[PDB]
C-alpha cells in the first residue's frame, strides 16, 4: 500500500543522520527535506566509491580542452553563441558566471531551497559525467555542513542558470555575492570561505558550466514538495476518519466489495485505510443508535464529501505517488551537459539541464492538492451546518447562549478564502512557455517556478488541515456533551414521571422525546414552551390525555411542567461545567485528540475560554509545519497491515 | 517501451471484429474506438447470465418485501431520507426528472454509442440489479446503429445523458433517436424498426442505467485512444524534423538518457537512435557542418536537442491516464452495490468520476506539451536563420517576391498553439457545491474530456501542417543536392576551359561548395548575392597569391561563360525536379504517402494547389487513421 | 485631454502632499493613499463631520437599548440573523473574538493604508461607530502604530480588520507594530500613545469590521503603481525606437485618427513628441538610405504595434483607477444607518466586487504590458532583429568571453512567463460561503493581492529593459565613432596607395555601408564583411580598369590596413568606456549612468549585472524614477 510507503518516507526523514552521496546510493525526497530541515543532518561524500571517477572526468576535459578538441561550452560559446571558438578557457568560464549573476532583490529563495541545492548539484557531480574538480565537491560538502550558502534572488530561471550561478559566485570568492553562516551572520563570500577554512577556487575547463547547468533549484524545491505532499496526503486520508465519526457517517462507504468492483489502486488504498480506522468504532455506534431514533425520517446515506472519500482521493493518491518516483529520478541523474563519456573519448551534446520531468508533475500535484483543498472545504462546510451535522450546533458553537458564541464561523470564512486561492494557484506554469534566450531555448521547462507554485498550494492546504482538525476536536468534545447531556434529561424525565406518578404509557412517551429531541436544539434554554423539546413533551401530553381519557391526570402533567421548569437546566448546567473543567478513549483518532488538547493544551472552544481562534488553530498549524503531528499519525495508524 | 504497446493498440484497433463482453474480459480503448469509429465491429454479449438474474430476482424481492435501500425504496440524492413502496413509479419518476437537457449541438453518436457499450459493460458484473432482457436490448440497439439525440451539457459526472438511453429504452415519444447518419425517430418508432418493445422499469432499474460515469468514461477512451497514436507520431516526426534541419543525431545517444533515466526520456531516445542510425540525411548533415565547421553552430536547438527530455513527462502521462481510463471502463460504476451472495445492498459513490476527470485535465496539459514542441520545430524550419541553408518560409521561388511559402501555415501554427495553451487550463478546480448541496464534490469528468477532446483535435491540425513542412523540407533537400553539384560542374569546366590556374580552380570550387545555394537561387549571376561575392573574393586572393594581365583576361571570361550558362543549368536541374535521399530514409513512408498516395507535390507559385487543399489531405489521413500505415511501416523492425 | 496629464497629476499629489484631510466631503485619491503608506512625514487630519458621527452613534445606541430590531445589532451575524438579543456590547465582543482567526504562517504600508479607508467610511455618518474611536484611529496612524496581520482569511474583509478592532479594544493576543523597530502587546502600544482600550458599544465591533478596506487599501497602491508603470512603458517605448532604429512614423496621428481609440490616440500622441526632432531618428534615416533596397520597410510589431497594443491596456487602468477611488470614497458598512428618517437600511455594502473583478483586469492588462517588454527586449539582443546592434548587446571585442546581458534575456523570458500565469482570474474561483449565507463574495483581497504581485515583476522587466536601453545608447554612439574612423583610415590609405579615384570611392561606400560590429572583433580577419566587401570592390576595380602596378599598389592596400585600422579601433572604444544630448531620453541616460553611477556593459567592468539592475530597480521601487520621467516629459502639451 501506499500508506506504508509514505510511513516509510517519514520514519526515514526521523531517523537519518547522515547522507551517503557516492554516484549508486539512492537520495529520497525525505533524506532532501531532512538535510533542509535539521541541521544535526550531515552529508557524506564517500571518496572511495566516486573520487577516481571524477579525477578521470577532470582530467579528460582539461587535457581535451587543451589540447582544442572541439566541445560546446568548453571551448565553444553558451548557447545561442555556441558558433563561437576559443582558446581562452579559464575566462570563458568566469565571464559564464559573470554573466549569469543577474537575479535581483526586490525588498529571495530560502536557505533550505539553497541547501538542498547544493545538495543536489553535488549529487549529480558523482556520475563523473560533468568534468568538474573533486577539490570542489569537497568544498561544497564542507560549505553544507558548515551552514554556509549564498542569498539568492527569487526569480530568473527557465529552468537554473541564474540560481546555480551564485552557488558558482560563492566557490569563487565573488565579493557581490553574500552569504550565509547560520541564522545569524551574514558577509561577502570571500570572507565566509575564509571562515571555514576555503580559498577562493580560479575556474578551470568546462566548471563554471558544470555549476550552473543543471535542474538542482527547481528539484530540491519539488523534493521538499513531495515530501510534504506525501505527509500531508496520508493525514487527510486519516482524517476522513475522524470526520466520519464525528458527523455520524455510516462505515459502509469503505466495504471492500465496492472498490473491489472500481479497483484504482488509490480507491482501494484509502477505502482500506479508512475501514480499518472506523472498525468497532465507538463513535460509529453513536451513529448507529442515531440512524435508528425516527429512522424513516433521516437520510439513508451520506453527502458525497465522506461518501465518495475514496473515489476522490484515488486520482490524488496516484499523481502524489508517481510524482515522487519522477522528482527522486531528477535528484540521482547527471543533469548537466555536455555529458563526458570519457571511457569512449567522447563530449555527449544533449540537454540534460531541461527540467521538464520535473515541470510538468509540479503542475499536476498542484491540481491534487486543490482537490485535497476541496474535499477538506466540503467537509468543513457540512460540520458547520445544523441542517447537515446530525444533530451538532450551527458553527460548533457551545453557547448555551448562541447569541454571544459564533463558534467557528471566523475559521469557516477563512476555509472558503484558502479554497478559493488555492483553485486559483492550480492553473498550469508549463502552458505559458516563452521562446527564450536568442530563440535557442524555445522549448523550456518552468520547473522552478511550476515548484514554487506548487510549495505555496501546500501552504495553504497545512492552514486548511489545522483548522480541520482543530474543528473535528471541537466535534468530539460536543459529541460527549451531547451523550451526556441525553443521559441527564432522560433521567430527569424519568424521575419526575414517578414523583407526579404519572401512568406508564405517559412515561414511556415522555422518554422518547428526551431521547429522540436533538438537545443543541434546546440547550440554550431548556424549558422554552417554543423549543423542540417542550414541544415534543406538549404533544405527548395532548396524545395521553386522549388514550386515557382527567382532572387528576392534567393536575398531575401540570406538575410535572413545573418540576421540570425548576430542576432540568441546573442539572443540565452541572453537568456541562464538570465537562468544562469517555468515547473518544476507544477511537482510533485518540491520539490526535490528546496531542491537540493536552500535549498543545487547549480546550472545548466557547465564551468562557478566552484564547481566540488564531491561537488555538496557530498551535496546531506549528506542529504541522514543524513535524510533530507525525507523532499522532503514527501513533493512530500503528498496527495497520 | 511504451512503443511496442502504442503498437499493439493500433494493431488492435485495426484487427478486432467483435467486441466481447462477458463481465472478465477488459475493454480497452482500442476496443472502444473500434466499436464508434468502424460499424462492421459488433458487441456479443456472452451469457455472466445467471450472475445478471440472481441480482435482479434478488433486488426485486427485496424491494418487495421492504428492505431500505438508497434509490429503490428511497429517493434520490439529497431526497434519500422520503420512502416508499411505489417501485416503479420511482424509477419513472427519475427519468421524467433527469430529461433536463436543452439543444442549443449534441453529443455526437460516436460518443453516445461507447456510453452504450461501457453501461452494458459495468452491468455485466452482477451488481446493479438491471434485468437481463434490458442488456440485451442494449447489445441489440447497439449492433443496430441507435442511439438516443443527448444534449451536450448538463452533467458534472453522468445523470443527464444517461437518462436519454434509459429514455430510449422505455420508448419516450419526446425522446428523438437516430439510426445511422440521418434517421431521426421517436423512441418508440426507433424500438420497432429494430424489432425491440419499450420496457417498464422494475425497481432500481431507472438508478441503474443513470447512475455511471459511462459518457465521461467514454470521450475519455477515445481521447486516450487518439493521444496515444498522436504521442508515437509526434516522437517518430521529430527523427524527421532532424533529417530534414540539418541535426546532430547524438541528442539521442543512449549514455545521455541513462545517467537522467526518467522512462519516457531513454524510450523516445532509443526510437530515435534508431530511426536516425545510417540515415542518408543525417550524412549530409555531417558534410555540412565540416565545412566551414567554425563559423556553424556546435550543436542544435532545444526544439530538436531537448525532445527526449521534454517528451518524458508527455509519454508517462498518457501511458498512466490510459491505464486509469481503462479500469474505469472496466468497472462496475453504479450504486448501491448489490452483494447478493451475502445479502446486502453496499452504499458509496462508484458513480463518481474523479480518476476520470483528474487525468482529463493531465493529458490536456500533456497535449499542449506536444504542440509546444511541434509550434518550435515549426518555427525554426520556417527561419532562414535557424534552418540550416533552407529558404526563409520554406519557400521554392526562385522568385521570392511572389512566392511567401508556407508562411499562413506558420501564422496559423501560432494559432493553433495558443489555443491549445488556453484549453490546458484545469476543469476539477471549478467545483461547485451542487444538487441542494448532497454533492458537494463532484468529478467534472465528462466537461473536461471534452476539452481534452478539443484539444486533441488542434494537435491533430498541428500535426498534418508540421509533417506538410517536413515532406516540402525533403523535396528542398534534395534539390539543394542536386543544385550544388550542377553549379560544382560548371564551375569546374569553365574554370578548365578558360585555362585557370589551379590556385584558381580550386578556391572557385571551395566557394561553389560553401555558399548556401537558396541564398542565390534567385538571380545566380547577380553580383551582389553571395555566389559572385563568393568568386569575385577568391579572384582577388588568387591575382594576389599568383602575382597577370592574362590571368585577368582569363578571369573575365570565366565570369562571362558563367553569366551565359550558370542560369540556364540551375533551371533545368530543378524544372526537371518539379516533373535520390529519402529512398534510403526510414521516413521514406511518411513521405511516399503523403506525395504519391495523397497525390501531392513540392509547394510553389507554379503548384496551382493551396495550402489548404494539401493540408486537408493530411489532416483526414490522420483524423480517419490512414496514417498508421505509414508509421507501422516506418516502425517495422524497431525493437524486434 | 490626456491620460497623461493625468497621471502626472497623480504623480504630483504623491510628492505634494503634507496632510491627507479627512472629512467626509473631499475625495481621497490613489495618490494619497499610496503618500501615506510611503511618506511617514505625511499626516492624517481628521475635522470636526464630527455633528453627523456623534448624531448616528447617539441613534444607534439609543435604538438598540429601546430595542429596534437591526442586523448584527441586536441579532446575530450573517447566518445567524434570526437570533436576537439585548446583549448589546457582549455581542460586539463575541462577534470580535469569533474573527480573530488567522493564522501566521501583510505589510504595515498596507494595514495602516486599510486604517486610512476604515476611517474615511466612517466619516459619511452612516456607521454609528463614537468620534472618540475614530480621533484614536487618527492618532494611531500619526503615531505609527498598527496591529500585525495575518495575509490570508478574507473572502472580501472580516478576518483582517478584526485585528485592527483587536488593537483598539486592546486584546493582549494581538500584537502592535510601532515604527520600523519595536513590537508589543495591544495594551502596551495603545499605553504608550496615550490611548485606553475601548468597550464596544452597539454596532461598533460590526462597523470596524463590515467594509472592504483591505482589498480596496492595497488596489490603491496597486493603482497608483500601475499608473507610474504605464506611463514609463509608454515613455519608454519612444527609446526603444531610438536605439533600435526605428521608424516614428508608426505614431503619425492620421494612423490613430481612423481608429481613434483613446487610449491609441494617446500613446501615439505622446510618441510622436517624444520622436520629433530625434537626433538618433536622424541616424535611422542615414542608415536605411544606404542599401535602401535591402532593408525592412516597416519595423517588426513590438514596436510598430505599440499604440495599438497599448490602448486597451491604458484604458483598462484608468477605468479602475476610477472604480478604487470610488471604493476609498464610500459608506463600505452595514447596516446603513439613515438617522435622519429613523431607519437601518439593510444592504450588502460590504461585498467588494467592483474592486475585484476589476483587479482581475488590471492584472490581465499588466500581463500584456510585460509581453510588450518581453518583445522589445528579445529583438533587441538578437543581431538579425536589431539594425547593427551586436548580439547581446555584448561590446566585445572578444565575444567569446563577454555574453553581454544574456543572463538578463533568460530573466526576461522568466519574468513574462510567471507574469502570464498570474493574471488568470480569481473572480472566477467563488466558493459558497460562511452556512452558505455568502453565496456569492468577491475575493477582492486575494485578486489585489495578485495584481500586486504581477506589478512586482512588472519592476523587474522595466529595471531590466531601461538598463539594456542605456547599454544600446552607448553601443550606437560607439558605432558611430568608430565607422568614422574607418571611412578615416581606408580614405588615407586609398590616397597614400596612390589608388584610382573610383577605386577609392567604392572602398569608402564598403566602410560606410558593412555594419562595424559585424567585424570588431578582428577588423582585419579576412572572413570577416568589412574584408570580404573590400576584396570584392578590389576585385571589381581590377575589371574596370582592365595593372601590375594597380595590383602591386591594391596588395598595399589590404596589407597596411594592418598597420593601423585596429589600433584605431582600440583607441577609440577605450577612449569612450553627442548624440543622446539631444534626445529627450537624456534625463533617464544621466540618471542611469551618472546618478546610479554605472557604465557601459563588458568583460573590463568589474560590476555585475546584478549590482547594476538593481541600482535601476531600486530607484524604480523607492520612486526617485518619476524625477528623469517628469523631465523628459517637461513641455509636453
Ligand atoms: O546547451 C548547453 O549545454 C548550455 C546552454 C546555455 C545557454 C546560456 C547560458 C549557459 C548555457
Ligand atoms: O447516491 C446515489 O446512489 C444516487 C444520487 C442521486 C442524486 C441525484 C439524482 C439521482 C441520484
Ligand atoms: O451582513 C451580513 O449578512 C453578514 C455580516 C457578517 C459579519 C460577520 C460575520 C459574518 C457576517
Given at each position: 500500500?501506499?500508506?506504508?510507503?509514505?510511513?516509510?518516507?517519514?520514519?526515514?526523514?526521523?531517523?537519518?543522520?547522515?547522507?551517503?552521496?557516492?554516484?549508486?546510493?539512492?537520495?529520497?525526497?525525505?533524506?532532501?527535506?531532512?538535510?533542509?530541515?535539521?541541521?544535526?543532518?550531515?552529508?557524506?561524500?564517500?571518496?572511495?566509491?566516486?573520487?577516481?571517477?571524477?579525477?578521470?572526468?577532470?582530467?579528460?576535459?582539461?587535457?581535451?580542452?587543451?589540447?582544442?578538441?572541439?566541445?560546446?561550452?568548453?571551448?565553444?560559446?553558451?548557447?545561442?553563441?555556441?558558433?563561437?571558438?576559443?582558446?581562452?578557457?579559464?575566462?570563458?568560464?568566469?565571464?559564464?558566471?559573470?554573466?549569469?549573476?543577474?537575479?535581483?532583490?526586490?525588498?529571495?529563495?530560502?536557505?533550505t531551497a539553497t541547501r538542498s541545492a547544493m545538495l543536489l548539484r553535488l549529487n549529480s557531480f558523482t556520475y563523473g559525467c560533468?568534468?568538474?574538480?573533486?577539490?570542489?565537491?569537497?568544498?561544497?560538502?564542507?560549505?553544507?555542513?558548515?551552514?554556509?550558502?549564498?542569498?539568492?534572488?527569487?526569480?530568473?530561471?527557465?529552468?537554473?542558470?541564474?540560481?546555480?550561478?551564485?552557488?558558482?559566485?560563492?566557490?569563487?570568492?565573488?565579493?557581490?555575492?553574500?552569504?550565509?553562516?547560520?541564522?545569524?551572520?551574514?558577509?561577502?563570500?570571500?570572507?565566509?570561505?575564509?571562515?571555514?577554512?576555503?580559498?577562493?577556487?580560479?575556474?578551470?575547463?568546462?566548471?563554471?558550466?558544470?555549476?550552473?547547468?543543471?535542474?538542482?533549484?527547481?528539484?530540491?524545491?519539488?523534493?521538499?514538495?513531495?515530501?510534504?505532499?506525501?505527509?500531508?496526503?496520508?493525514?487527510?486520508?486519516?482524517?476522513?476518519?475522524?470526520?466520519?465519526?464525528?458527523?455520524?457517517?455510516?462505515?459502509?462507504?469503505?466495504?471492500?466489495?465496492?472498490?473491489?468492483?472500481?479497483?484504482?489502486?488509490?480507491?482501494?488504498?484509502?477505502?482500506?485505510?479508512?475501514?480499518?480506522?472506523?472498525?468497532?468504532?465507538?463513535?460509529?455506534?453513536?451513529?448507529?443508535?442515531?440512524?435508528?431514533?425516527?429512522?424513516?425520517?433521516?437520510?439513508?446515506?451520506?453527502?458525497?464529501?465522506?461518501?465518495?472519500?475514496?473515489?476522490?482521493?484515488?486520482?490524488?493518491?496516484?499523481?502524489?505517488?508517481?510524482?515522487?518516483?519522477?522528482?527522486?529520478?531528477?535528484?540521482?541523474?547527471?543533469?548537466?551537459?555536455?555529458?563526458?563519456?570519457?571511457?569512449?573519448?567522447?563530449?555527449?551534446?544533449?540537454?540534460?539541464?531541461?527540467?521538464?520531468?520535473?515541470?510538468?508533475?509540479?503542475?499536476?500535484?498542484?491540481?491534487?492538492?486543490?482537490?485535497?483543498?476541496?474535499?477538506?472545504?466540503?467537509?468543513?462546510?457540512?460540520?458547520?451546518?445544523?441542517?447537515?451535522?446530525?444533530?451538532?450546533?450551527?458553527?460548533?458553537?457551545?453557547?448555551?447562549?448562541?447569541?454571544?458564541?459564533?463558534?467557528?464561523?471566523?475559521?469557516?470564512?477563512?476555509?472558503?478564502?484558502?479554497?478559493?486561492?488555492?483553485?486559483?494557484?492550480?492553473?498550469?506554469?508549463?502552458?505559458?512557455?516563452?521562446?527564450?534566450?536568442?530563440?535557442?531555448?524555445?522549448?523550456?521547462?518552468?520547473?522552478?517556478?511550476?515548484?514554487?507554485?506548487?510549495?505555496?498550494?501546500?501552504?495553504?492546504?497545512?492552514?486548511?488541515?489545522?483548522?480541520?482538525?482543530?474543528?473535528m476536536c471541537q466535534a468530539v468534545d460536543l459529541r460527549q456533551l451531547e451523550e451526556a447531556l441525553v443521559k441527564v434529561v432522560?433521567?430527569?424525565?424519568?424521575?419526575?414521571?414517578?414523583?407526579?406518578?404519572?401512568?406508564?404509557?405517559?412515561?414511556?412517551?415522555?422518554?422518547?422525546?428526551?431521547?429522540?429531541?436533538?438537545?443543541?436544539?434546546?440547550?440554550?434554554?431548556?424549558?422554552?414552551?417554543?423549543?423542540?423539546?417542550?414541544?415534543?413533551?406538549?404533544?405527548?401530553?395532548?396524545?395521553?390525555?386522549?388514550?386515557?381519557?382527567?382532572?387528576?391526570?392534567?393536575?398531575?402533567?401540570?406538575?410535572?411542567?413545573?418540576?421540570?421548569?425548576?430542576?432540568?437546566?441546573?442539572?443540565?448546567?452541572?453537568?456541562?461545567?464538570?465537562?468544562?473543567?469517555?468515547?473518544?478513549?476507544?477511537?482510533?483518532?485518540?491520539?490526535?485528540?490528546?496531542?491537540?488538547?493536552?500535549?498543545?493544551?487547549?480546550?472545548?472552544?466557547?465564551?468562557?475560554?478566552?484564547?481566540?481562534?488564531?491561537?488555538?488553530?496557530?498551535?496546531?498549524?506549528?506542529?504541522?509545519?514543524?513535524?510533530?503531528?507525525?507523532?499522532?499519525?503514527?501513533?493512530?495508524?500503528?498496527?495497520?497491515?
Open positions: 500500500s501506499h500508506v506504508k510507503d509514505i510511513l516509510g518516507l517519514i520514519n526515514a526523514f526521523n531517523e537519518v543522520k547522515k547522507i551517503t552521496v557516492d554516484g549508486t546510493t539512492p537520495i529520497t525526497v525525505a533524506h532532501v527535506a531532512a538535510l533542509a530541515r535539521r541541521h544535526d543532518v550531515k552529508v557524506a561524500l564517500e571518496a572511495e566509491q566516486c573520487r577516481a571517477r571524477v579525477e578521470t572526468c577532470s582530467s579528460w576535459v582539461q587535457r581535451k580542452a587543451e589540447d582544442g578538441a572541439d566541445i560546446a561550452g568548453v571551448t565553444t560559446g553558451f548557447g545561442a553563441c555556441s558558433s563561437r571558438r576559443t582558446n581562452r578557457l579559464s575566462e570563458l568560464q568566469e565571464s559564464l558566471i559573470r554573466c549569469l549573476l543577474a537575479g535581483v532583490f526586490t525588498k529571495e529563495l530560502p536557505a560533468s568534468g568538474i574538480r573533486w577539490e570542489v565537491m569537497e568544498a561544497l560538502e564542507k560549505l553544507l555542513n558548515s551552514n554556509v550558502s549564498p542569498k539568492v534572488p527569487l526569480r530568473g530561471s527557465v529552468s537554473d542558470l541564474i540560481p546555480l550561478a551564485y552557488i558558482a559566485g560563492l566557490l569563487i570568492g565573488k565579493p557581490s555575492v553574500i552569504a550565509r553562516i547560520g541564522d545569524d551572520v551574514e558577509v561577502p563570500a570571500p570572507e565566509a570561505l575564509s571562515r571555514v577554512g576555503l580559498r577562493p577556487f580560479k575556474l578551470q575547463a568546462k566548471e563554471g558550466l558544470a555549476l550552473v547547468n543543471g535542474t538542482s533549484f527547481a528539484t530540491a524545491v519539488a523534493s521538499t514538495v513531495m515530501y510534504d505532499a506525501n505527509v500531508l496526503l496520508l493525514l487527510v486520508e486519516t482524517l476522513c476518519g475522524m470526520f466520519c465519526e464525528v458527523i455520524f457517517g455510516r462505515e459502509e462507504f469503505a466495504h471492500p466489495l465496492i472498490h473491489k468492483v472500481k479497483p484504482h489502486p488509490g480507491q482501494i488504498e484509502s477505502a482500506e485505510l479508512l475501514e480499518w480506522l472506523l472498525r468497532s468504532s465507538p463513535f460509529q455506534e453513536l451513529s448507529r443508535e442515531y440512524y435508528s431514533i425516527d429512522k424513516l425520517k433521516k437520510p439513508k446515506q451520506d453527502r458525497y464529501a465522506l461518501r465518495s472519500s475514496p473515489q476522490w482521493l484515488a486520482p490524488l493518491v496516484q499523481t502524489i505517488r508517481d510524482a515522487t518516483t519522477t522528482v527522486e529520478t531528477e535528484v540521482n541523474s547527471a543533469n548537466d551537459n555536455p555529458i563526458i563519456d570519457h571511457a569512449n573519448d567522447r563530449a555527449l551534446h544533449g540537454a540534460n539541464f531541461q527540467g521538464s520531468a520535473v515541470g510538468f508533475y509540479m503542475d499536476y500535484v498542484r491540481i491534487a492538492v486543490a482537490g485535497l483543498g476541496k474535499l477538506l472545504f466540503a467537509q468543513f462546510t457540512e460540520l458547520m451546518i445544523e441542517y447537515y451535522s446530525n444533530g451538532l450546533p450551527g458553527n460548533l458553537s457551545l453557547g448555551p447562549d448562541l447569541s454571544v458564541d459564533y463558534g467557528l464561523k471566523g475559521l469557516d470564512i477563512a476555509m472558503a478564502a484558502y479554497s478559493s486561492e488555492l483553485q486559483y494557484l492550480a492553473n498550469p506554469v508549463t502552458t505559458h512557455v516563452h521562446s527564450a534566450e536568442q530563440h535557442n531555448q524555445d522549448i523550456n521547462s518552468l520547473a522552478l517556478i511550476s515548484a514554487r507554485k506548487t510549495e505555496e498550494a501546500l501552504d495553504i492546504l497545512k492552514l486548511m488541515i489545522a483548522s480541520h482538525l482543530t474543528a432522560e433521567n430527569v424525565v424519568s424521575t419526575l414521571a414517578d414523583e407526579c406518578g404519572l401512568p406508564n404509557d405517559t412515561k414511556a412517551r415522555l422518554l422518547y422525546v428526551a431521547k429522540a429531541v436533538p438537545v443543541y436544539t434546546y440547550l440554550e434554554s431548556p424549558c422554552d414552551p417554543t423549543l423542540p423539546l417542550l414541544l415534543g413533551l406538549k404533544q405527548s401530553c395532548f396524545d395521553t390525555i386522549l388514550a386515557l381519557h382527567t382532572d387528576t391526570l392534567v393536575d398531575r402533567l401540570a406538575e410535572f411542567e413545573k418540576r421540570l421548569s425548576d430542576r432540568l437546566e441546573n442539572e443540565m448546567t452541572a453537568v456541562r461545567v464538570l465537562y468544562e473543567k469517555v468515547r473518544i478513549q476507544g477511537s482510533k483518532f485518540l491520539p490526535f485528540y490528546r496531542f491537540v488538547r493536552e500535549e498543545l493544551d487547549t480546550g472545548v472552544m466557547s465564551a468562557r475560554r478566552e484564547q481566540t481562534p488564531q491561537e488555538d488553530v496557530q498551535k496546531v498549524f506549528d506542529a504541522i509545519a514543524d513535524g510533530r503531528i507525525t507523532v499522532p499519525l503514527l501513533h493512530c495508524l500503528q498496527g495497520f497491515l
